[PDB]
Symmetry: C2
Subunit: 159 residues, 2 copies
């Protein structure tokens, strides 16, 4: 029942009667704790003009299931591997997009890929979740949904 | 620095160099607990083809601040008013959209508007958060980001 206005690289824009719909690939995100610090990442995000606090995340590529994508994103963004457990999923904004995010826990982390130079295209930000939440409350950092989900999951289940 | 491909009702689509960007109005969401039940809502969401478990939510309209929009959405979607406290915010998916959601807690709820007939355009779903999480784990219901945030916040801070 949909008409396409635009077919792009990570999204399509469609109209469905009165509804404006953005089709988007599904995503993964990985919650990881070590020594009381959560593994956050930051990168410049042109859609928002700032670098919010996120957790390792990205799009599921052709051929992959969510577990495999989660492994890949953890390795590509942080150089780590771990034992991954599926937690839950969510639709990021079901009033306009079908993007669905599958969230995993990672335990028993090991460095498998060295962090080249001082590369900060993706910045690795180990931070206690309590400190992330305080910084946010102070107006000092913004959250993505994945970062906030990580912080809340920690406070609910990992203390 | 942006070129517009489409200017719509709740969104615009723009390109910014290589980046596909969906501009979207900011949103609010309201977490409310009563007698151990969380106030969820469900509605058909054409972008996803199903009705996920959400919490009362919607777009900030012209003239409003987030607190006012939260009050309005609580009343319009559930017929309730309460004492609202700002909690935190998040970007729903900062890899492609600027939608930012401001989350509030509502306490001391009162019914101010009667629920007409048996109207289920927005369905009011009081449910224990533990039951929502079990149903999701069983594959029986999907979450929006707002619904999942509500469930996690409850488990972290409201028991």
């Amino acid at each position: 029942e949909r008409t396409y206005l635009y077919r792009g690289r990570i999204l399509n824009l469609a109209l469905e009667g009165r509804y404006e719909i953005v089709e988007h690939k599904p995503a993964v995100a990985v919650i990881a704790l070590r020594e009381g610090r959560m593994l956050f990442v930051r990168q410049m995000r042109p859609a928002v003009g700032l670098a919010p606090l996120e957790i390792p995340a990205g799009l599921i590529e052709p051929g992959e299931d969510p577990l495999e994508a989660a492994r890949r994103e953890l390795a590509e963004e942080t150089g780590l591997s771990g034992d991954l457990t599926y937690l839950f999923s969510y639709f990021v904004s079901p009033g306009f997009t079908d993007e669905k995010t599958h969230v995993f826990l990672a335990e028993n982390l090991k460095e498998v890929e060295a962090h080249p130079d001082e590369d900060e295209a993706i910045e690795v930000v180990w931070m206690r979740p309590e400190e992330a939440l305080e910084r946010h409350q102070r107006g000092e950092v913004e959250f993505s949904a994945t970062g906030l989900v990580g912080v809340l999951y920690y406070h609910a289940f990992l203390r």
